[PDB]
Design a binder for these strands. Sequence first.
RNA 1: CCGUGGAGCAGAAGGGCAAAAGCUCGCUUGAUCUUGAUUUUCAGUACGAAUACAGACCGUGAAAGCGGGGCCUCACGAUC
RNA 2: ACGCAGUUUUAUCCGGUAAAGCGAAUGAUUAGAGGUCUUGGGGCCGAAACGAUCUCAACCUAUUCUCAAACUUUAAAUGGGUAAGAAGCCCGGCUCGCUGGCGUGGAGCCGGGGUGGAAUGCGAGUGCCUAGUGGGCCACUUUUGGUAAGCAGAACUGGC
RNA 3: GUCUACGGCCAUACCACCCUGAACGCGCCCGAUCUCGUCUGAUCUCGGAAGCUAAGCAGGGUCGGGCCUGGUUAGUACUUGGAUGGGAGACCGCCUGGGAAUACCGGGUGCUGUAGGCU
Lengths: 294, 208, 169, 157, 68
Amino acid sequence: VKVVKNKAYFKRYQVKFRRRREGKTDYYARKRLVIQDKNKYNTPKYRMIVRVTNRDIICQIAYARIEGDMIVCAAYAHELPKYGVKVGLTNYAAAYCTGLLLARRLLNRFGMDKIYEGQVEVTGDEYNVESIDGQPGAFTCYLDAGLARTTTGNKVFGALKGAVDGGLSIPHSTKRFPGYDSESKEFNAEVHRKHIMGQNVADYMRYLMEEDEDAYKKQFSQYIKNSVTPDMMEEMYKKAHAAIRENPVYEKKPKKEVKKKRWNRPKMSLAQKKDRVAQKKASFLRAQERAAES
Amino acid sequence: RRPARCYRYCKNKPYPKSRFCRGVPDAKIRIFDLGRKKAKVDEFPLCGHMVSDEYEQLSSEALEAARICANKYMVKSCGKDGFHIRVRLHPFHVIRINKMLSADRLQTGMRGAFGKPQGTVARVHIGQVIMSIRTKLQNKEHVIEALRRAKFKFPGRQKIHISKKWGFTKFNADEFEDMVAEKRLIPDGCGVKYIPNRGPLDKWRALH
Amino acid sequence: ENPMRELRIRKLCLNICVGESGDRLTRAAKVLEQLTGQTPVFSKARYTVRSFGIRRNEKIAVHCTVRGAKAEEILEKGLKVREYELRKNNFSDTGNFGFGIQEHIDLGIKYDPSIGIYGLDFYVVLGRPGFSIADKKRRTGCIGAKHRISKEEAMRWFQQKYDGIILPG
Amino acid sequence: TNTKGKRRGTRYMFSRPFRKHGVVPLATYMRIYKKGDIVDIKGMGTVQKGMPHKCYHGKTGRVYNVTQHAVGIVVNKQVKGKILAKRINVRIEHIKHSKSRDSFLKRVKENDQKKKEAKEKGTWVQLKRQPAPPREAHFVRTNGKEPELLEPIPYEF
Amino acid sequence: AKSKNHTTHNQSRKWHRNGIKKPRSQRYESLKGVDPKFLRNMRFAKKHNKKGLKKMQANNAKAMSARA
RNA sequence: CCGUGGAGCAGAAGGGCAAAAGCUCGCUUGAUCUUGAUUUUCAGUACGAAUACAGACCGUGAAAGCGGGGCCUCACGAUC
RNA sequence: ACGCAGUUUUAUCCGGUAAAGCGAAUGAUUAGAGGUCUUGGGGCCGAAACGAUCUCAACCUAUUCUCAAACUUUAAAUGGGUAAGAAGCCCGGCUCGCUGGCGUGGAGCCGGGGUGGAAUGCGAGUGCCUAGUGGGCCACUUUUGGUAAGCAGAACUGGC
RNA sequence: GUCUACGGCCAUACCACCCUGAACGCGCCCGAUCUCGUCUGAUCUCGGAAGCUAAGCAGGGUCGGGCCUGGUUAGUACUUGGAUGGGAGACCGCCUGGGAAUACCGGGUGCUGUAGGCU
Ligand SMILES: [Mg+2]
Ligand SMILES: [Mg+2]
Ligand SMILES: [Mg+2]
Ligand SMILES: [Mg+2]
Ligand SMILES: [Mg+2]
Ligand SMILES: [Mg+2]
Ligand SMILES: [Mg+2]
Ligand SMILES: [Mg+2]
Ligand SMILES: [Mg+2]
Ligand SMILES: [Mg+2]
Ligand SMILES: [Mg+2]
Ligand SMILES: [Mg+2]
Ligand SMILES: [Mg+2]
Ligand SMILES: [Mg+2]
Ligand SMILES: [Mg+2]
Ligand SMILES: [Mg+2]
Ligand SMILES: [Mg+2]
Ligand SMILES: [Mg+2]
Ligand SMILES: [Mg+2]
Ligand SMILES: [Mg+2]
Ligand SMILES: [Mg+2]
Ligand SMILES: [Mg+2]
């Protein structure tokens, strides 16, 4: 009596798209990130995909082909305890750290480590990579922020700054890095340098240790249950960038079987389904006979 | 009212009462069922229907006269509510009239010659049923005589068939009582609802 | 014996529909400012009418959304005024309700002769943890069937907390 | 008097057919168009910038020019008393390859491999395409059962 | 004063007298209308072909003649 | 809460569009200068409209790009 | 053997008409059955009461009969374009201010290597000058206006 | 036998409801001092990790609705070409070739690429 339900709605319904129903892309920006202009005919346009997830950030470089996307090089946030970043897996320091790791790993795969050193002393400047004549050209790549909103302080820009100091020629404007004053249009390099080296959580740990030890034992428990103190953080990432820039080689795991198959129910067959139907017939007929009499 | 000899064989494209006509008067017929409208299915076993042989047009006034003649012969023959008659064919084509003397030469010639809408006719394909009368088994001669008396009042030549199907439905009269008695066909007023067995099981559980 | 599935006050909606714009509307916004401790947000009309005198893009009403501690406090004041007695048809079928009050100084704020007396509409939605899927940008899905709130669950929660009276008449 | 402007006979032709409305899939974009390819032209109503015309729908031509995000085609169009090779500039969204030329390139590569193996081993492989020959004198089987007898059926209505 | 306005009768039989042949299409098609950036490339490409293509191609012709 | 266009896109209809071509907001003048090619009407002349480029100087965006008027099909005019 | 074709085949695309469809969107439209939310309206228990009940309409559910030049999921036959090789393959190298992780891509140029690549028929290509013509009609089939015409107006092919 | 990130085909992969999910992983979740943005830390942004698979998600099921495919429909409706064929006309039958759709009935209900990880 309420509405007219829905019957031809299904017969006329278009699905949106496979990635769009899950909600992971938009295609209105992918149709301008992916597609290479036809004057170059083969030379792919490299996308730096940086995805923020709870407990883990993902830095990948991919490109596009008609069979699918081909990922050249990938670096993940949980690899950093092998490099000496024990905890802090999703901070802005881990963003800069993973970008630096990804740039060093790509340049180590292509063999262009010794040239294009980029930046060693972390300053947070507008350091754009110049190509060197008489040498192979610099790797050029373009960001994908994804569905996440580009706001000053989004750590996809921290991953960008990590890759840029690693030595990837990525075009960027400075006004979305954190520490940028929004009213007065100047940019401060020292604030962004402090934010890369991670003295924000240093100040917030000192703030919690002054104000309330209840919250300091509420969060930061994994910090104190291995070790974190602010001077050790500010020297820790300083150690960690050199530890990455000396050995980015990534030692692949042995994977292996050593496992017992069996987790998930397979598809039951036609005859078994039809005999389920037959038992559902026979039991209801038996009930109709018996309980109506008794 | 122009003679129906000229408004005959389907020459022009179908021109329905629609968004573009906007000035066609009402059709002549308005009701379509005359007998026991609320008759259930087993109350009338057989049906005789009227098959067109030619490809032509039929006018709404002709349908109006024919259903009245068949109705009158039925209610004089086998009593009120001893029949259920249905005109299966509806008029939707709209014919045009370009009328003149609007007696002198001096109005216009054939200059503006898209005619005004005259009225409504019904288009017929060969082998399409005009009327269907569902009655008892005893009323077989009365159906034949009634559709004979309507045959003179339609134009052209068309024949009269006595159906193999039970009721107005599309199922065989031989298979019908043998198959409604147990399983599939549930009666629904004058109609008959078919059931497949590829439904949810709630239909079969609500049955039996 | 149920894992982390708790009915909690998701947000609390506060509405004042003044018939006109200007002075009385501004004083109504001042009322909601004194209740919430935050500035209200205005409303308007897509189409006017001229029968009761509203025009297009006239600032007709004010409202506010209050979340958390102040929300449960102002809900406490509302049930304190209406004596915990809410009728059954005050609940919607989808699990949320609204009850409303007149005489805005029943809640416990000093009256000024400058402002006046307004009729204040309270609307409560109910929330379980997990409802914040449908609002966020990136991954959005249907909420599901067993997780959503029913008429019965809402009225039993209002029987449990605040000791409400249900009034089936 | 037929109001001779662009795109007038196209209530159906530039339409996206059914259960395919929406964004353009990207495999149409990510294809390689070299000078000398053979392409089909098909209208897409979703991209309204560079639709060719209503004349060139379905016509199959040769590629001769490539720009940033379009392509120039040469298409044999018939006008009044003679056919002409015109030069159109069409965006990429309306274009796909003809599979005919790729099938012919597979024919050519099979012919070259058979030619090399034939010159190797002295075999005469007959690498032309022969059209459908008449049926050879085969030999049917009627074991066990007499042939089924068919007759025309009596009329009923 | 009325005349037959437009028709296309007796037109195909006129068109197929001399024959509706194709537009010839000779080798090395006309190169106008192509991308000016590509054309600016190909002109310097051709003249520097004819400039520097003497010595190393003569060496490679001698080398391929020595091989075969 | 449901809601595959049942709305809106200035207008006559048709086509197309749903993290959009719709609504709101922030910046803005690419509605700028210039040579050509091509389509459309077609005699394979023109005006008009349009397509794809090229070179400046810019706007925007983090960036990829987008933009040289209106989401597309009409909105306009030789010699002297 | 060059080349060509009012032709067929072999592939490969394109269309939205004939037909069909409405229990698929839009538009019209016939009739029955089921259901109890919503009223207004009739009747009844009654001081009155969504106090209870019967009825009506509307509504919804599955059905049913008929349709569409300015509707359509589907979708013919006839038809339109392209391809069926030396201007093509394959190898090797040079040049580029274009492109750019890369001696990378793409074009051009050079040298080398192997023509037997559907059926059928035929000689083709090309230039100049220019007469007459710019009042048409009929026939099969498809079709628009009209009651219709030896009427007016179109399409394909032939004829006069 | 699986998931994550990016995808290609764009419903065989949707929608409704009910079951099950060990390890990683995605999440849900706990808070606003910095970067950020709102009436509102609900959304967006940011430091985490006490809990939780209840939900999303992933697998399975529904004589499920829809989709795809295959029979029946049906050599039927139509149709290239032809006849000094029938017929008053309407149209219909034949030779030549090609050949469709709904109700009806049966079957299925994702396949994959690149990089990474758990049994
Ligand atoms: Mg975006
Ligand atoms: Mg008379
Ligand atoms: Mg003339
Ligand atoms: Mg929703
Ligand atoms: Mg429209
Ligand atoms: Mg947008
Ligand atoms: Mg430019
Ligand atoms: Mg048409
Ligand atoms: Mg038809
Ligand atoms: Mg002369
Ligand atoms: Mg002349
Ligand atoms: Mg003359
Ligand atoms: Mg015929
Ligand atoms: Mg004539
Ligand atoms: Mg005449
Ligand atoms: Mg704050
Ligand atoms: Mg702020
Ligand atoms: Mg929160
Ligand atoms: Mg879950
Ligand atoms: Mg569960
Ligand atoms: Mg099914
Ligand atoms: Mg499933």
